[PDB]
């Protein structure tokens, strides 16, 4: 019943008119499998559901950038390096010599 | 369309015509929210799916005892800190005063 997505194509697109800026990510489980399903999907105690980050009343806006719920500042923060898409990647660095991408080019695929 | 069941009621009335020993367990994930859901649910990189543990195939096995696919050993082994339920409940022991139960009674519902 319950099965998990192993490609998922993240897009801006579902945004009633908005002019997307970067192209569709394409997010796939099988490089973040060693992390925690609930470090990502952090509010799944809140609703005991995983649901998309974009969902309505989470990070859908796409109006303001510097907000929690902003899509720009929600996936490319670098002052959270737990759940943030270039915020762990930049953290990885820091670690030691790390392939995760911070290239806009990487993440966003053309 | 993904909901995690808070309560669960673990039961060995789904075979065939098994003669249980003890009464029903029940799980609350609750208490166990803290633990990354991959370190029980440990075969989700093999289906890429959250199924139960007596799923056929895997700890179905009531007839025998001492095999990996054995209801009793899965459960209740101290050799496996991760994922057995005693076993981890035993573990947490070693680190200090813990109130995670080992009494049949506890986990086991009358
Ligand atoms: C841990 C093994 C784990 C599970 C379980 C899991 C499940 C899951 C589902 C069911 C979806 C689909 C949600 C939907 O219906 O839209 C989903 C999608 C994404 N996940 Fe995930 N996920 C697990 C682990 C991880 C980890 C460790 C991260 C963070 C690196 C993560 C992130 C994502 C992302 C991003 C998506 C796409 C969400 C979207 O908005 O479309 N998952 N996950
Ligand atoms: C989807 C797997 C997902 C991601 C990715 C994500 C990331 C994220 C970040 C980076 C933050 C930190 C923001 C900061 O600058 O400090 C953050 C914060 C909150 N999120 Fe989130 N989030 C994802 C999923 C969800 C979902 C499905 C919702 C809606 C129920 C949501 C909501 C929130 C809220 C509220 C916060 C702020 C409070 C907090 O828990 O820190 N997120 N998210
Ligand atoms: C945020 C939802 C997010 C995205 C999107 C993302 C993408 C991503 C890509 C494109 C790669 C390269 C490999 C691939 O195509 O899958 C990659 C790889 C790694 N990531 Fe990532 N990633 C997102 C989120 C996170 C988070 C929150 C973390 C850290 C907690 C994280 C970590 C990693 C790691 C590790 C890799 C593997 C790098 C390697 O050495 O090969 N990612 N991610
Ligand atoms: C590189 C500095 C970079 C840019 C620039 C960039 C832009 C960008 C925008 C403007 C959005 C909003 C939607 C739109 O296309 O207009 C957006 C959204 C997401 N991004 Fe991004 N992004 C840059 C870098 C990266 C990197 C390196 C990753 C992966 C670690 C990444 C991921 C994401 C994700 C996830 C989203 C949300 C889904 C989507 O709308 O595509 N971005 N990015
Ligand atoms: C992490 C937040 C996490 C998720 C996600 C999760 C989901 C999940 C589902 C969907 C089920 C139902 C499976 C079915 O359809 O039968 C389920 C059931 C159980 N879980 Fe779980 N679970 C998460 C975390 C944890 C953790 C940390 C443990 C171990 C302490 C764990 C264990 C269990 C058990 C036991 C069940 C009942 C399984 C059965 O055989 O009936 N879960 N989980
Ligand atoms: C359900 C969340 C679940 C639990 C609990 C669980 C526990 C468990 C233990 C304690 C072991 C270790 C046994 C030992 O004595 O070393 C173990 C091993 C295996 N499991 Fe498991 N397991 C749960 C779920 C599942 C599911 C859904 C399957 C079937 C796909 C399954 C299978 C196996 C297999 C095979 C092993 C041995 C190989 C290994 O990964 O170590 N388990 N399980
Ligand atoms: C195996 C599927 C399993 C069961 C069953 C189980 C049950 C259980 C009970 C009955 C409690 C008491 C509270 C409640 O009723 O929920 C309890 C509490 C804790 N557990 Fe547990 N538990 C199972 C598995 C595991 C595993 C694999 C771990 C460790 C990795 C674990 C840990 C804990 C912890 C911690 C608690 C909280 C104890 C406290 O201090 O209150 N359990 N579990
Ligand atoms: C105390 C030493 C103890 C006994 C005895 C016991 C027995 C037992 C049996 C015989 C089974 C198989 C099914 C049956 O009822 O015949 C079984 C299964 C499970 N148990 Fe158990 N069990 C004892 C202790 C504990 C403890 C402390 C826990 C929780 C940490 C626990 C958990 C489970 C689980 C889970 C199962 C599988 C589901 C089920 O069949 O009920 N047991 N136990």
């Known amino acids: 019943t319950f099965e998990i997505p ?4 993240m897009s801006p697109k579902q945004f009633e008119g908005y ?3 970067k ?3 394409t997010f796939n489980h099988a490089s973040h499998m060693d992390i ?4 990502c999907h952090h ?3 809140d609703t005991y559901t995983i649901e998309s980050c974009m969902t309505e009343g989470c990070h ?3 109006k303001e ?3 929690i719920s902003s899509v720009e500042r929600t996936f490319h923060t670098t002052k959270d390096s737990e759940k943030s898409c270039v915020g762990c990647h930049r953290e990885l660095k820091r670690q030691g010599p790390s392939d995760a991408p911070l290239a806009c080019n990487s993440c966003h695929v053309q």
Chains 1, 2 share one sequence.
């Open 23 to 25: 192209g569709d990510v």
């Open 36 to 39: 925690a399903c609930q470090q």
């Open 6 to 9: 192993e490609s998922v194509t």
């Open 65 to 67: 950038r510097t907000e």
């Open 19 to 21: 002019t997307p800026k």
């Open 43 to 45: 509010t799944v105690p």
């Open 60 to 62: 859908d806006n796409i």
